[PDB]
Amino acid sequence: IETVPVKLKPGMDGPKVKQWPLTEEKIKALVEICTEMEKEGKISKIGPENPYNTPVFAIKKKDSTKWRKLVDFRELNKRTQDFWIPHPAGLKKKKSVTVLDVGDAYFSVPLDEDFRKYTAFTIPSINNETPGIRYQYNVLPQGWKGSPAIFQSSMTKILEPFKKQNPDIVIYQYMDDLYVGSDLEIGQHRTKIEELRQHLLRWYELHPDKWTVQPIVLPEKDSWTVNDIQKLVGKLNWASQIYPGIKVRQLSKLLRGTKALTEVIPLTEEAELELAENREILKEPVHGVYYDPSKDLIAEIQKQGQGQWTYQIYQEPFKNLKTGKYARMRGAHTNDVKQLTEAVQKITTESIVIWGKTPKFKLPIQKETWETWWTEYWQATWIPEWEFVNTPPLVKLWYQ
Amino acid sequence: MVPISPIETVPVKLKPGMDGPKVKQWPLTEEKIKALVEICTEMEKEGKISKIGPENPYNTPVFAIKWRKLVDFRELNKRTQDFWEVQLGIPHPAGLKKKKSVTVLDVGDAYFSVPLDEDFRKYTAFTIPSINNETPGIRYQYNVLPQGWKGSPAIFQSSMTKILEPFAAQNPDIVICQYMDDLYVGSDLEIGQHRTKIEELRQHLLRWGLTTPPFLWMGYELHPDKWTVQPIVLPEKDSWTVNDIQKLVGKLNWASQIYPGIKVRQLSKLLRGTKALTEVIPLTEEAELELAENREILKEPVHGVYYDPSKDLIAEIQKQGQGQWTYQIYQEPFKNLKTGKYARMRGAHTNDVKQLTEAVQKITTESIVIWGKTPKFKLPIQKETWETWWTEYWQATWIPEWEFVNTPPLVKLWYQLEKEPIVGAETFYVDGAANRETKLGKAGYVTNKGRQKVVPLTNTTNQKTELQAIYLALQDSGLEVNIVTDSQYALGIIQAQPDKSESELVNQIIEQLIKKEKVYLAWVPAHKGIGGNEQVDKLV
Ligand SMILES: Cc1cc(/C=C/C#N)cc(C)c1Nc1nc(Nc2ccc(C#N)cc2)nc(OCCCN2CCOCC2)n1
């Protein structure tokens, strides 16, 4: 009921980010939504005295045909002091984790008047005709990094009964999302959540236990071709960049001479021992792999084709904190970019559950291609950072 | 007197830590001074400006060019804040709709009638030097938006929109615009009902105290039924300066939005890493024909139509050649809304598919800006070609809804690397080494059939010989062939699948691959003593 003082960082002005073009239907959906949001005092039209701007678009979520207003507060977020919960390391260990959209609750809290100028955004017009309808936020804006940190106080007071009623249920909050974990049974889990939905009214289901950190494996054949062994050695050589005592000399010895690629080379005892010793090494985890929360998390995605995608999360090269594999079919068999986007969401969501912050992605896609279409399949309320890799990584065939 | 609604002022501040302007008052002739005194008198009579005293330490210079008053806010603008864009980016004619009638109204009577924020008028203080400097010059400040000030256009058009807003949502059968001293309204209504609603507008502006084809607009010509560009003037001269090239290039790109087949590569090739205004630059035979073709294109006028939301939107792309593409956008055959082109990005290697994709993404972006939707595409590429490409492409890639059009040249795939090693195909282990300091090196291969070759090379590098050895392996082999290499560089290039390259070496590799039936291309790590893969034959 009282605006907490909010200011920017030393030597930084508010966000002046260009609004990218929106389609006709998304513009209508934003017009309809903002028209009402204005009436509820959530937003108020601003004049030309406000120079700042944060991009804004519209999406559609699961089991919902109603549009949602997405504001890309990425530039405004990195221009906020923040520093106002130690990440619950038990969330990634629960049988089931549920994700809830507690964004509506933020709109009951007024915003610091001096800061409202930085929450400026523009609903664009088609063909640069009329000037874009401009708004600023009066309440707490969804997606803003300062939104949950401020509401962190109010939220602790809301979930005070539920937590103490059952201290076996873990609860976490990142951006507009509330994450709830439980080792219970799904039927009782959904009702326990149904109980938590009515508990929130008066004031997507994951399974982290169905996931680990994928290892590196080598083939088990009875007869090996030259090409089979050439790949094997190639993988082992790459695996040596990570694991210590990986030796390839006894297998390389088999390749001596200049045989045909499809010719079968029988394994020697010296080599069979070496391959076996290499397996044992790969079985063990990676040595001295820790997580420094001061550094950036990097995600690398490799398109494997046939709906399959591989990824890795790390901070220092050859020191993965996690590696995974996807192949889901959410009615996207004809579209690579939709798959990539759903994959980026998935990874980012998982990244939130484990470390409590999103990673920086390296996407196997042209900047121009991605930038045109990704919003058309985005269904998350947060947005990570991303680079674009243009050189075909050899490591693709080493993670499959 | 009917009470005029007061236009709410937009609060203006300076930049943080900056004091207002304080420049010297420019010495004027007695003629210029006598002129300004009359103007500033009748302006003060019109309620535009007002007289002030010595309490205002801020000074703004003022000139007089012949009659007309000029105020130089060159230093105040350096001290005035930033405003919202409003609206950096003009509407494109191809997006507008056909209107049966368009009326013109005057807004020169209304510009000066827009108040300025009170606590900012003290920065607009200017001095009129009296005769012979024998008196303290007349001090004055503005009470409305000055012409030339940093924030005037933004506040003007903002307050203007705010006024027209009710008389626009209540009249969906009407369309308005602001350019520049005038106001333009259009409708498809009867000439009677149209002239009526214009009177309803003049009376709506009268409330705030405002009683005031073909059209030349932003380089376009706007007709009630169609649009085009204002005639493009290409400077004809035997001597071509660097500045005249950019003038020629800029005017050609402008014309390419409606004139189909416009090419601009050969003229843009002559602006690489050169920053000058004076240099008589020659032209190739490819450039002279190009400019002669453009003059042949611009010899007959062509018109674009307007957008009717009731119909499909369609974009058609054709390969011009040499990394150049052209597109036409329409709803009905032969009736373009607009045209345009796409030039390939500055790279070393590329293929037609990747370029076609880029053009589509450009058009798509351009389309959404103008019509707010994605168009259907007619593309010079067989579905299979696209089907093979994107499924196998290491990258993620996508093209919106589209259909194939059989208008050659067709975009195709010229070769496809095997997924698995080929049975019965000879296996060429290749390497290529080069001495860094002597620029000398070797490149060659050995095969499972005893076949060998090492070729000696002068003036070359490691990355060049590793390519070369593959070129040799390609050269001396059957229609089917496996190739092992240790060059992550050589593989990295071919796994990007170019059909054209800057390096002629690569181009020759490409030509070789094309002539082949099946090509498998394996990779191994070097110096791990991998047999077949010999370093001892090339390193020497
Ligand atoms: C009137 C006008 C005059 C000039 C310059 C004149 C000079 N000097 C410049 C502009 C830019 C406009 N403004 C305008 N003009 C048209 N049609 C039109 C027809 C014939 C002629 C002629 N001859 C000229 C114009 N249509 C529209 O918009 C319609 C679509 C609206 N929606 C809104 C929601 O999103 C979708 C688009 N705006």
Residue numbers in the entry:
A (entry chain B): 5 to 88, 94 to 212, 232 to 428
B (entry chain A): -1 to 64, 71 to 216, 225 to 552
Q: What's written in the study?
A:
Reverse transcriptase (RT) from the human immunodeficiency virus continues to be an attractive drug target for antiretroviral therapy. NNRTIs significantly inhibit the catalytic function of RT by binding in the non-nucleoside inhibitor binding pocket (NNIBP). The compounds co-crystallized bind the NNIBP causing RT to adopt an “open” conformation commonly observed for RT NNRTI complexes.
The attachment of a longer propoxy morpholine to DATA compound 2 retained potency for RT (WT), RT (Y181C), and RT (K103N/Y181C) variants. We compared 3 crystal structures of compound 2 in complex with RT (WT), RT (Y181C), and RT (K103N/Y181C) to examine interactions that promote affinity for Y181C and K103N/Y181C variants. Key interactions such as the 2 hydrogen bonds with K101 are maintained in the RT (Y181C) and RT (K103N/Y181C) crystal structures. In both RT (Y181C) and RT (K103N/Y181C) structures, the absence of Y181 causes the DATA scaffold to shift toward aromatic residues Y183, Y188, and W229 to make van der Waals contacts. Antiviral data also complements the analysis from the structures as compound 2 retains nanomolar potency for the virus containing wild-type RT and variants with Y181C and K103N/Y181C mutations (WT: 0.0012 µM; Y181C: 0.012 µM Y181C/K103N: 0.0013 µM). Crystal structures reveal that 2 can maintain most interactions observed in the RT (WT) structure and new interactions with Cys181 of the RT (Y181C) variant are present. The addition of the propoxy linked morpholine also provides potential new interactions while improving solubility.
